[model samples]
Target: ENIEVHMLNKGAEGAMVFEPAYIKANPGDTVTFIPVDKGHNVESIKDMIPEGAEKFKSKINENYVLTVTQPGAYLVKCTAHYAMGMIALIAVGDSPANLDQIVSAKKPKIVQERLEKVIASAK
Candidate 1:
């Protein structure tokens, strides 16, 4: 499981947005998108093209889980913000051969020493 951050324009109608506009994942993997605030959604846009695909919609403040079972490129977007550049390209497969590695190579670590100092100085 991996987490990605996406911002929402407060008070703007159809403000839901997907960062990067594209993603690549392997089969049996799950991608979760959590809105920082309210008023956001993830909807499938597979049917918009010639080779229409499956379309599913998830509401705000909820978990939008996409299980990659088929090996293909999926077109997805926010129904309310589709025309506003809220689009996402998902590539599903066993493991992309020439994977560009969109995510970071190394995981982040916490500075335990700094945390301890801060805790000790707290009133």
Candidate 2:
């Protein structure tokens, strides 16, 4: 399995950015998230995760890396700036899992928009 590396950068405050925001990975593959700035950590969203999948969250003070074993889509965001659309998407296996639920979920308008934009670029 390959290790997919993602970088978190703070280009501006109240702005969240993830390099390679959209990732397609296989089961058992691992992703290493490195923080390039301060005040950012990874956390999973309940509505965004696939059914039966384990929720993943990183400590608020450090980077959070994870391996997505279930074949589905994952929506991860930063606790500090989720309202600012600081979120990223991960697709495991073939198509993303729970596309409709993600699209219909109740989240920040910017967060939803960002995910929609990334999903468009995904498939």
Error of 1 at 106 (Å): 39
Q: List the lowest-lDDT window of 10 residues for candidate 2.
A: 5-14
Model 1 lDDT on a 0 to 1 scale: 0.51
Among residues 3 or more apart in sequence or in different chains, the pairs in candidate 2 whose N, CA or C atoms overlap within 3 Å are none
Q: How do the residues 5-114 of candidate 1 rate in per-residue lDDT, one tens digit apiece?
A: 36365322234456544566665777677666666677765433113235678886676776665555555656565555455556666343322332211211222222
lDDT of each: 0.51, 0.76
List ranges where model 1 is wrong by over 4 Å. Answer: 1-7, 10-16, 48-53, 94-123
Residue-pair clashes per prediction, in order, are 0, 0
Stretches off by above 4 angstroms in model 2 are 3-14
TM-score for each of the candidates: 0.58, 0.86
| Global fold similarity of model 2 (TM-score) | 0.86
lDDT of 1 at 74: 55
